[PDB]
């Protein structure tokens, strides 16, 4: 049986979620063809943490998780097993023991509108830094001053999210980028995902 989990649904598909609400799809009971991905020249950033390039296709895992979101170009560095900043501490924290990879490519032609597209959003404020693989979608309003914030919008107490100014004319650091995170759950459990050249194949 073909049993190929669809890379397109994670990459070739159109609708992408904002970074504060990174979409996660669980991956099990198929075969992953990594060769289809590391041969395309369209990706501009493609990093890995824990995996081999040549034996990439010959591995078996318990489960896989595919996260997808959209962020601008100059926040690509900010995703890493250890890193800080706006997105890293308030929207998406990669764990220090990260097992997997990160793909990212330019989406200026798709996610930018004339005069700017603001549908993509990112959290700008939170009281404690985000934990690894923690997706916070609370609309609670962030207190900045010592005066007790309250109500439904406050002075010096700002809404916790912000849109991206995605114009085609902005700098390339601002031109939008579609980003995918690949986490590899490896447990002492039934290994359901393998590659074309593993010992099960």
């Amino acid at each position: 049986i073909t049993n190929l989990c669809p890379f397109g649904e994670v990459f070739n598909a159109t609708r992408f979620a904002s970074v504060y609400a990174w979409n996660r799809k669980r991956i099990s009971n198929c075969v992953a063809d990594y060769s289809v991905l590391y041969n395309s020249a369209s990706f501009s950033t493609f990093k890995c943490y824990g995996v081999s390039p040549t034996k990439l296709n010959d591995l078996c895992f318990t489960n896989v998780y595919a996260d997808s979101f959209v962020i601008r170009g100059d926040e690509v560095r900010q995703i890493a097993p250890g890193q800080t900043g706006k997105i890293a501490d308030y929207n998406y924290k990669l764990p220090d023991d990260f097992t997997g990879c990160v793909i990212a490519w330019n989406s200026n032609n798709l996610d930018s509108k004339v005069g700017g597209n603001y549908n993509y959003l990112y959290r700008l404020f939170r009281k404690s830094n985000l934990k690894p693989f923690e997706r916070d979608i609370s609309t609670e309003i962030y207190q900045a001053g010592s005066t007790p914030c309250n109500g439904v919008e406050g002075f010096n107490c700002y809404f916790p999210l912000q849109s991206y100014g995605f114009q085609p004319t902005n700098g390339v650091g601002y031109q939008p980028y579609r980003v995918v995170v690949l986490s590899f759950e490896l447990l002492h459990a039934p290994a359901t995902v393998c590659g074309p050249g593993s010992h099960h194949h």
Epitope: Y38, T45, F46, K47, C48, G50, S52, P53, T99, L186
Partner: antibody
Framework: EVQLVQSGTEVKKPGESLKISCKGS????????IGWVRQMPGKGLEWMGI????????RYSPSFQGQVTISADKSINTAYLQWSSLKASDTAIYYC????????????WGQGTTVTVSS | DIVMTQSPDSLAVSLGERATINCKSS????????????LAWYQQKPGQPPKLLIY???TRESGVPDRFSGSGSGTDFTLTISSLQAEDVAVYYC?????????FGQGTKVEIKR
């Protein structure tokens, strides 16, 4: 497959600045984090540095930081070597190597280039 | 920074017989998150660029002979060989790549006991 080539092998006198290159090609070349290693005349492989195409370098090992010489023009698949006031001991052979991730083995290597600074 | 040091400095072994090298790490670095060992060995013929022999001390590489194998427990890592041969001879080295600095190895020369 993915291969690497080097150049710049030369005789120089000390205190002079030289640039070498590691030019690579492959199907997936973005994966391959490039690191540099020195084999001096005496036996010993040092792993002087590390960088990635795009993004940034990974931290240079503590001893070499100070004569650090890393990379540029990442679009053209070359990793330049930029340093000055070279020591008389810097004469050695130097290789480049690559792997997929931050903590991954060196898969493919280059021919190597030797340099002499004996004045 | 973690120190990698090889057990045998020189080594003279006649062909068709087992030989073993071992490396010491200051802090064992394996299965911090994932099952393999994630340290490797390299061999470099004199006058040659070095090559790799096994990924993660448990993954043979393409074009690697089937008599080469590696077993590494904790901080000790034993590289064993089934039959020494003429093309097998080279300088041997370790790699540690779980932490951000690498120190490699002292260097294990090889001879022929003949």
């Amino acid at each position: 497959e993915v291969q690497l080539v080097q150049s710049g092998t030369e005789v120089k006198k000390p205190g002079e600045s030289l640039k070498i290159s590691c030019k690579g090609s492959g199907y997936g070349f973005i994966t391959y984090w490039i690191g540099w290693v020195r084999q001096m005349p005496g036996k010993g492989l040092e792993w002087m540095g590390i960088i990635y195409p795009g993004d940034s370098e990974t931290r240079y090992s503590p001893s070499f930081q100070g004569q650090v010489t890393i990379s540029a023009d990442k679009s053209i698949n070359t990793a330049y070597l930029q340093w000055s006031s070279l020591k008389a001991s810097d004469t050695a052979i130097y290789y480049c190597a690559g792997g997929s991730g931050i903590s991954t083995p060196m898969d493919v290597w280059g021919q190597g280039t030797t340099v002499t600074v004996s004045s | 920074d973690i120190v990698m040091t090889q057990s045998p400095d020189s080594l003279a072994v006649s062909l068709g017989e087992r030989a073993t090298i071992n490396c010491k790490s200051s802090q064992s670095v394996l299965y911090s998150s994932i099952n393999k060992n994630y340290l490797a060995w390299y061999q470099q013929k004199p006058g040659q660029p070095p090559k790799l022999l096994i990924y993660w001390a448990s993954t043979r590489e393409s074009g690697v002979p089937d008599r080469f194998s590696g077993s590494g427990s904790g901080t000790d890592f034993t590289l064993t060989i089934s039959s020494l041969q003429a093309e097998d001879v080279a300088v041997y080295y370790c790699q540690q790549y779980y932490s951000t600095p690498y120190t490699f190895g002292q260097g294990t020369k090889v001879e022929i006991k003949r």
